[PDB]
Amino acid sequence: SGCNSALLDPKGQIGLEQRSLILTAFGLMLIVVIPAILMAVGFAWKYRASNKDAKYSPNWSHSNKVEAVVWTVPILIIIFLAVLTWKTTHALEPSKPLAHDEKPITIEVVSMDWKWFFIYPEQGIATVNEIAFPANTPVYFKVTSNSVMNSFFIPRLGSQIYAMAGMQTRLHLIANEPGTYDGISASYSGPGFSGMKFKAIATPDRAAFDQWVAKAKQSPNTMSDMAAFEKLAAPSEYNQVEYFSNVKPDLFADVINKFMAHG
Amino acid sequence: SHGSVKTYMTGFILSIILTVIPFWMVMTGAASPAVILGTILAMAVVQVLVHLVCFLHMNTKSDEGWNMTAFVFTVLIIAILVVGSIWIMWNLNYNMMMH
Amino acid sequence: MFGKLSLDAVPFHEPIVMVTIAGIILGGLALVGLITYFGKWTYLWKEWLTSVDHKRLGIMYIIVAIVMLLRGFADAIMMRSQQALASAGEAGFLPPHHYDQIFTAHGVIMIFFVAMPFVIGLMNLVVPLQIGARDVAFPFLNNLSFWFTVVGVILVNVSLGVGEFAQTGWLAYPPLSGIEYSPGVGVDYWIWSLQLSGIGTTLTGINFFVTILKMRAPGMTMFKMPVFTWASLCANVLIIASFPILTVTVALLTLDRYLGTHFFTNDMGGNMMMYINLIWAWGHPEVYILILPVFGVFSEIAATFSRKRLFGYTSLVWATVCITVLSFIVWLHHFFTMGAGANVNAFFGITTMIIAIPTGVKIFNWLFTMYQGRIVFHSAMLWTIGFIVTFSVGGMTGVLLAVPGADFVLHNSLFLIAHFHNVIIGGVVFGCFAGMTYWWPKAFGFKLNETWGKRAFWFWIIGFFVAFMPLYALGFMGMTRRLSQQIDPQFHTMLMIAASGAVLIALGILCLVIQMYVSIRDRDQNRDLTGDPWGGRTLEWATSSPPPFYNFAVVPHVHERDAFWEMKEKGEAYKKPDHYEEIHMPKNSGAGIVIAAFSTIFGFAMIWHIWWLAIVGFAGMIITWIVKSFDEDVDYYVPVAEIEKLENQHFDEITKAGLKN
Amino acid sequence: MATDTLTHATAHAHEHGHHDAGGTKIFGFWIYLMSDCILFSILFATYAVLVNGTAGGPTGKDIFELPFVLVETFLLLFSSITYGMAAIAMYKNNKSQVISWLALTWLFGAGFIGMEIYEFHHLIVNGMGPDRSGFLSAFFALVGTHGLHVTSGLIWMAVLMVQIARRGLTSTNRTRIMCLSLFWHFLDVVWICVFTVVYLMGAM
């Protein structure tokens, strides 16, 4: 339709591609679904019992041309939609990096009990429930969980990806337009799932993004080690944006190694 | 009386062979792993068919062919479920490592 | 045994002044209850609870389905009003620790104890009547499976009454369901309800597979069976092939929560993704377990109420069997967002579209059955056209969900919610009310009231659309499922509209109850007196209404598809044979009730960590099984004198109507 | 192979001419055994997925004593062939060969179960239970589900032996021995798949 919703009006290249395939699939299915509903109401009304001047062949129960057509048209619509499914599933794979001359910004995403934790490794900072990145720049999300399965989702920008503990998913996104986009967990995770909800800020340029990084380095609190991590990973709800200025250089690997611990 | 004593005893001897040889190939390591592993899976499969033919009296006309069919459909479901579950889980486990 | 005296208690009532009706007229259906009809009336123990007759067990399966529909619909009203209040800026009346329990319990109650018993009771009613069998292959097993379903219903009701059910979503995904993040007993309630009801369901599936294959009338080949029989066969194949997966998967969750094992436990070599894979490997054949016999009902109803033979029988049968094998290679479409990279996702998307093809063959066959024909607008007919429209809409939204690129933004949103509500409500629930309206005279001997059925249908279809088109819009707006608190205000108005839609469906359910009550107070002015009230083409209408308990004194000989119609065409319907031989019949047994009560004891003691008593309950099931195996007088013969009385009463009513040969 | 519109009796092929048959129950047990095949296959797929989940502990090669598994396999195969000899008695009538062959079958089956119990106890005592690792959990699930099936077959066999000793070789006992024949032979088939997939591949 013509909504200003997050999916019918997306602001990222991945979301625009998904909107295009949603509209294409929707129209291809309308080709076969709209005559079905129209013949449902029309065949209901037209061949009434009270309607004397109809044909009424009660013993006609098989044909070859009707049977051939009603097999044929679903076959052809499913062939076209299947070809488009093949091409678009290989094109919009979340683990596949985006074709872009800008080098991506790597953001590390950890689903805490009911909050979103973010690590910028090459910037060496951390945030809760807020990310920023320059617009028109590819963004590489390395996503894992800390407790249970979640689903990292910025609907205006692109796809979901599951956040699972002890294992690393990866997503590639980009924003085609500066702004502030609501992100959520899209997989229920317990009493607090309604609160785990963040903002992604697409700054208009790199200088505004560097200013947001420089604001994060002024934070008194540091994520220096695992003790600060488990202090922050204590369960809580609806937590505000906070920043961390010093980050242990491989914290993401440490969080995943908590669950791949051998001995 | 579908089974004779001779049918059961030939199934018995075949089962003894198809059990003792894969065990011997694994306990000694005589071949290399590939032509051990393929051998033990082949001999397991043919021993399963020997047990079905000899001990279950399994045939294409026993209950209007519905035993065989039920079994062929069941083997198709086992094939889809097990092989698909291994394929899905291997692709997932590849895609969860710290690249 | 000898003094059960057991009834149930009222769940709850909440006051909400949101739009002054949700919470007040929600109470108007919450207060629908009845006083004792003499609990363990000796008539009720002898003729209903111990009954191995398939007609009564089917009726009882539906009674359970309607009662659980009322309870879970009350839960759905509270959810919808809470979502409407929480998007308006207020803390609602439902905290998250109650709301999460409510949607987990509600989805469980709906799927299992509403959608399963109604379709299984419909098969128990009319499948042995359709194939010309006097009863099912395993009658005691049918009674035992009923009572296992009742045990599962009991477990979920006790958990909801106490306030301790699972809080994980209706499928209990594993890390959350783990003993670590859910230490409470509610997941155990979930576990043992699905175990005992799944044993019952597996027994039903085996029983109907053997009944359909082995006990149809002579002359009925495979391609002369009725369509509802073919659909029942196919859904029972799916039950047999899929419910062991549910049994193993929930048993593995049981071992994770009771023995401290590490199947899905995230740290010690476990893999929670294996549970999600296995649970959806069960759960997508569950879909077509629900939708196949409903497709059979709709084919039967369209054929009989179009006054025309069903169009393209062989193509629609092969479409049923095509759906039946295909349902097993599509289950990854519930997790595209997990992270199989594009090859597996592409494969399962293609196979889900391959599902979408023979369903279209079904739909267009039902259209071209109606392409000629004096179509009388019965209640069941209106349910059929409303199903075609609604299910077409839901099916195209699911094929939109089947694309992995589209699913990457639509997974776990309210678009998916509105999908499965579209297809389940339209297909399954419209088929429920269509089949109940269609076979009520065959169940009881009198017709349902027509105008209240029309009113219930119109409220159901309009209120469904008002309730669930905003969830399509909301899923496009980015609202995900299972949101409870501090919902974003941009959603609010759509949620408000959905709230109104839920209210309208309430009226239809109220209308349904009213219809039933009216139909019982006007029994004598609305009975049919023959077994053929609508006309009819399959040989369950060749009996009386209600059938005799022995179900065709003389087993019919078929010669042709739609046997009753071709006996009414060339006039050898209603033919009185000279002599009746003796009829073999099993006896009523209370042993299914005892095994069920021991399973109730075992499940409760397993939930509350009694350890002992769980042994006593398990031993009670095994010893009752063995002692029942020791009994020998498991059957009796009905004499020819009682057969002559009933069959003479039937032929007196036929010749009073005016049919002789 | 013909279509007879006029044969209006209940005539069916002879097979001692009763036409109140137990073949419906045999077919029903066969369909149940296909469902239980699917049950065991889901456990097999779980073991295949979780086999490398040796968290910090032992692998299959570290655990499995192949001679002991060989004695287990011989015991259960002997049980299968002795139950097959029990079905040769019935069909030749002559009870007390049924009881003797089922008794030898029961001792062979109780041998198989007792060595399985020995391995389970030896693993749990040495800190190597199902709660140690995912591989050990899947091993215990698959092997112990087969053991629970063999155990339930042993209770069914003892109850059936008591019923044959009391009531003789009745028509009820016909279909009961054939149902348990299906169950027991299928259990030996499942164990063939078990020692191939779990033990032989594990101790490779």
Ligand code: HEO
């Ligand atoms: C019994 C109800 C039912 C029915 C009938 C269906 C039928 C279908 N199921 Fe819906 N499923 C059902 C029950 C569910 N499925 C679900 C989830 C679900 C998802 C999850 C997406 C996600 O993860 O977000 C997908 C892709 C599908 C695919 C389908 C498809 C393609 C059909 C098709 O078979 C529909 C076929 C009908 C059509 C297509 C319309 C008829 C018109 C035709 C056919 C004309 C020709 C058109 C074409 C050929 C395109 N199922 C869930 C979610 C569970 C949860 O959320 O926890 C439930 C309950």
Ligand SMILES: CCCCCCCC/C=C/CCCCCCCC(=O)O[C@@H](COC(=O)CCCCCCCCCCCCCCC)COP(=O)([O-])OCC[N+](C)(C)C
């Ligand atoms: C209990 C706790 C454990 C849980 C066990 C759970 C199972 C419990 C099962 C219990 C079953 C027993 C109750 C119903 C029996 C009706 C038939 C009968 O007995 O004949 C009656 C004659 O006819 C009548 O008087 C009414 C006939 C239709 C009633 C339909 C009720 C259900 C409708 C819903 C949909 C049905 C399915 C529709 C499918 C298409 C005899 O009279 P009566 O029955 O003594 O009087 C009934 C009272 N009434 C007159 C006010 C009505």
Ligand SMILES: CCCCCCCC/C=C/CCCCCCCC(=O)O[C@@H](COC(=O)CCCCCCCCCCCCCCC)COP(=O)([O-])OCC[N+](C)(C)C
């Ligand atoms: C991963 C999850 C694993 C789950 C599965 C674990 C293993 C599950 C294993 C299941 C296999 C056992 C089922 C088959 C039993 C026989 C059925 C049959 O056809 O009856 C035949 C004979 O039967 C008899 O004579 C009665 C049966 C004897 C008692 C059986 C005790 C089983 C104990 C354990 C029970 C399960 C314990 C489960 C523990 C968890 C024919 O019947 P009939 O001649 O018509 O008359 C019989 C009399 N009756 C009508 C009363 C029947």
Ligand code: HEM
């Ligand atoms: C008028 C009828 C119904 C209404 C108003 C209704 C409403 C709802 C709502 C609001 C939810 C939660 C959606 C969310 O997450 O925000 C839900 C979940 C669900 N409903 Fe219904 N529902 C209805 C009927 C049914 C029926 C008939 C079924 C039959 C199977 C069903 C099965 C489910 C399932 C499986 C879930 C998901 C449970 C979960 O989230 O864990 N519903 N329903």
Ligand SMILES: [Cu+2]
């Ligand atoms: Cu699905």
